[PDB]
């Protein structure tokens, strides 16, 4: 029946969370947005924008759209353009993980994307190339949802009224994953008029953000957060903005996924946790309507990955649930089956020999013993690093001909072998290395660098 | 309003393809299945099967589901189980690309998967471990959609009737992506009864498949195809099965994606091409209803990737559309802009020296000249491979002390330097190597192995 | 007492070989030349030539010597020049052993050496740079012992007369390591005059040499052999030249070293074998005087090395004497200690997958089995190489989508695991690879290339 | 004439140094010992000891010699044994230059050598295996020149009397390379008796040695020096021992080689410098007799090598004489002529990203700038090492989510690009790294570790 796929955007259903809402609180339903053809709630802002531009006249037939497509934007924008038969050229933060720009290309959109994080002030960055293309090409258009009233108008038309119709105006508080504006600005501006002041418009934003009255910071939840107040936003709409920490967002997303079957992204998790928190000041009998405008399936590379979420130092439970042993043993090899080798420098060898052996085996810490490595029973005397000798060879306090036995540092303390990594790092907090002994024999050396590399590798 | 996310499965919309249907043919609409909460059309089978099992009694509350989850099954099955609060244990073909099992775990399903392609006949394979777990665990259940009448029952209940309601019974031919059966069987068995013989039930299956009366073969479109006739299928339902080639399937998928904004998987492309072909024997005024029960977003790793689709030797157009130059130059380096000294071997050096130099530079073909490499003007005389000498050192027809100048093979022919890779391979069809000359000087050597490696690397 | 070190050249002693002379033959004494200050018998030519040049006038005080120093020439020539206080500039085969040019530099001789084996015909080669320097520098001199009568005159003065004095003219046959001439010419021209025709002047030269009436060939015994007859040689002096094979020369050198304590070079071994052979036609009571004008200590890198003498395919006994087990086991690893599983490709995987897996593990031959690698009991069916598929992918007789099970070559035969390498190669003469089974299981694959690499590595 | 090669040991000539003696000092002649058949002065001790043992009775015919062979011992010992037809088994300190044990094997001596520097106190070391073999094998003998009066007896018989005969007792002072004592003890004990007190017996020993009344230390001149007073030495013989520094020994050896054509080892250089110094307290008209009992040709690997003598931090002139600056440019690559990227980590990327990028490119110091690397003009603001972040990630003073712009260390100072390495290290003495700018742009980073690695690699 539908004339085109684009005419299925909207009418997103509502679900009732049952495991993410502590007992005794009112119903907290969620509006999922990944059921739309574009896979993201943004395709709505897209269609409206395209309709408005076509009705305006500044975009003649046969023109070319151009703007920095963060990623999901190209989705809806290219969808609409292909529906009507337009072109799509995207110049955005190179960030776009390979998958993002691969998908954007798949929808028939030429990309000349340029690296981000570099303030151009000249044609030497992503916004630089974007502006250069805008100046160059004819019949183009810079939608720039950041500053476009039609953006929020879209939501004011068919983003909040749908919520009212589904809930029949029986919604106490509407939280939203604040961003450029739209969703929040439009949803609040609509829900407030039809209910006077009966509804509170909450706003979720990662801590340390401008919307929360803080300072700048890097971002890990794509789409949310910003540093310069976009002209398409007005705080007068929201009642009070509630901040949320990143560490409590990804964990919330994983929880929600395992307990309510919502493979949503990160912004959805942030909104969910925010809403949850809001659900306390309002007593029971209240209906909280949260929004999850990101279906997380391309996010499965990192957010649900056990490594990427471990590099940033927050993973409160492994995906499989059950915590597992991660003995330093495998951590000590990461390639060897039994063990790599207890590299040692007998205390009679020359300092140059020790420095060379360290430079050849790629280590920055090594014990020095008298007898052979294997037979050693933990009586090692010397403990030579790599930075100390390098700082002593030039400081005149040593000479290559000198024997290492007169410059060895105090023997670095040893720790367990089968112990969990967690304790290993906890102990590493007070020392820059340690000697792992295998059942009672010095078997290897562990340094913070290696532990971090192992934990981040996967 | 919805009690749970699972209660949004069904009611998939219909779209009208406008660029994949040659003019003059009747309307060929498609039913997309990736708008469901599970992201795949299989979740409907999941819900029906779970309902039937619960109503039966063989799955008591607090039990545990267990079966080989191809990948998307893990989606719907775990969705339903989490809705009702069950467990999920999957033992399937290790195939499941990292993303597949990562997503399955994300939905809270313990996986003890096992490698596939190995006929166990004992506890040594994926089905082996599946059967062992089935025998071991209590309160379990082996759904095995392959043999479950309730599977096709679901399609017969709420998979075809929806099509009839949307089209009001005005559907000439219904093509489907025949798989373990389901849709192909349920949809036909329903549509036929309400329309007598007014509707033809077409079936799409990759060539060289049992459903098409052929021989076994590997698979590249997950879900489709099979070798042993599943007990849950009956060919008496379909009117006539139409086969399709793999090479014309992925290309069709990419085409459909770029021309109708349908980021569907591969099986969808196969079904689309099938119907497309069927749309000829039936004249205009006919209404065709194709099915695309796979939303391709996790497929973006390979199907829309420019490399994976190139390793299998079929890519009729690069994703960006415009064909690009891929001269042997970069192909000759893969790691450099200049050029590693065209590994040479003066015809006076000993054969042992040449074999050693080849073994050290990792090459299997090298020209031998008199003067220095750079100044050479294409008068190279010798052309020594690596297999010939190895076959001559042991065949008594040569000795290490011998000079290479008495065993060099005829000088291998040279080709262009800036020429496209396509011509390079076309010419390589008649020789096992060639000497690429850079503007008029022998610069490198190209062998089929290196060309394939370059084309498959990306 | 000696005014300078150079005045100790000459008066080399004579020794009696007792283990290199089969019983029943006459005494065969040897004149060692490595007891001179220069370490080589050539220094005598150096001193004579320098004396002649100084007495002539074409080399004024403060001049500069220049000529291509094969290696030991740099010894005596620089010795004399430093004695009198001259300079030394050497342009010769760059392939002059590293140790060789290091030693030459140590004696205070600037080297601008150039690569050899390249016929310059222009300023692009070792002789090219030598001639350019000769033309450029003033007060220079090109000794070029190749064409200098004073060279042989040196021997005629104080190289043969010493032999006569030591033996009192009681020498039947004098063999010598014929080279640029010198000893072979001077010694004979002197010994013949004082004994009429009582002494036969034998000449030793590696087979396939111009001096032996043969064809050109590469050289492995530095100093001996040549292709163009030097103008400083006259065959009318020698009685009859006897050729010798290289394979019987190095072995003779090692034998002599172990049985007579003569750490001499290779030319010495060739001369020794020559005389040894000559000692048969002449009955007992004859006194043979061989010459060993090369003390082999810098030759200990290769000649006495167990690897370099193995790369050229002749080593009739290991240095330690006792033959040792090699076993393909270690030959199968060459790294770590245990065999890395076994590259396997199940016969259901796609051909592209097999080619990629071969390209990633760096192998050119692999068996294909049904079950897992370890449990396999030698029932492997497929045997796919790397050249066959590459020749079949382009020959139209296969396609990447095709299954490897329809193109596998006949399963390559297996051999023993603990067997000696000797038998391994002997069997490899009839096949290009084999499957090494470890106690009854296919453990690895062995190819001629790997065996040669192992034997040449050491 | 000679019955065997061993009967040429002795009668070493004397030479007059002309460039290593200061004008105005008396003649300082040297006795070279590398003209003997064994190549070392030790062979004389070998012959004497073998004669004594044979005449004693504790070594019956058909026995087996066994003792720890340093490097030249096996030479003479095996020479004598092969002359008489004995066996040779050597268990000595490991490290023995590969060449050393290769040569020892060449003379037909089985070696079961064991690692050194490990105090066994059990069969776990070189002396351990030596003692075990001595206990095990029958008909053996432990010569142990360390404690054998016949050792010094040899020198007393035919090591000093030869000096007296050559100089006719006209020798003022005899310096010697004191080692186990044998040489010096015998020479002094003989020369003193025939001249009363007319001759001073000087002794040369590297500084920081027991013979010089100092403390223990590693050794770099093989043969000289010792820690425990050998029982075969008596200081009552020498008049006064003069010490010498290692740094002034190798340089003296190289000087002597270039200026007097004496390719002697290191101990010879030490003795020469000793005598040289002694030649001052004694006025002109004095005749000094130095000893060089080591012909350095196997030492050409390191002593005359430009790298090994550079690793130990003393090389006062390159072998070729002319100094040639080694600009940091090549030092900054060691892989090519162009620096391969420096850093693009702008002060906005996350700390985890920076640590990962450092861990991937193998660096411990990197600048952080705003714009692109190339266009940068030296306005870099951040300077992040690798140890600081690792010490801040665990110290609670930072978190992975934090931005690096709040933890960057003060920007490390820059230095020149074409400047000589010497100045580079001199400046590095005050900092642990620097930023090398290429003509005015930051091109790379230099750290002490890299400089040392470059200087030691060669
Ligand atoms: C999950 C998620 N939630 C919300 C937003 C922004 O919408 P808002 O400003 O109404 O919050 C985004 C941004 N994504 C949009 C930008 O608005 C895009 O064009 O791709 C998002 O990815
Ligand atoms: C695109 C597509 N179309 C159809 C099917 C199978 O459904 P059918 O047997 O009714 O054809 C699959 C298999 N996918 C299902 C198996 O039925 C799964 O559990 O993941 C599929 O991926
Ligand atoms: C062992 C041996 N025997 C002989 C010769 C040449 O001397 P001849 O020409 O008198 O035979 C050489 C060459 N070595 C000389 C070249 O004459 C050199 O300058 O190094 C040699 O190495
Ligand atoms: C240059 C030099 N000078 C002297 C000695 C020892 O002799 P001495 O103890 O008489 O001094 C050595 C040791 N070299 C002997 C050990 O005596 C060896 O067997 O190799 C030496 O290398």
Author numbering:
A (entry chain B), B (entry chain D), C (entry chain C), D (entry chain A): 3 to 460
What does the paper say about this structure?
Using a combination of biochemistry and cryo–electron microscopy, we characterized the first enzyme of the transsulfuration pathway, cystathionine β-synthase (MtbCbs) in Mtb. In this study, we resolved the full-length structure of MtbCbs in its native, activated, and substrate-bound conformations.
As the substrate channel expands after SAM treatment, our next target was to observe the changes after SAM and substrate Ser incubation. Furthermore, we were able to capture the formation of the external aldimine/aminoacrylate in presence of the substrate Ser at the enzyme’s active site.
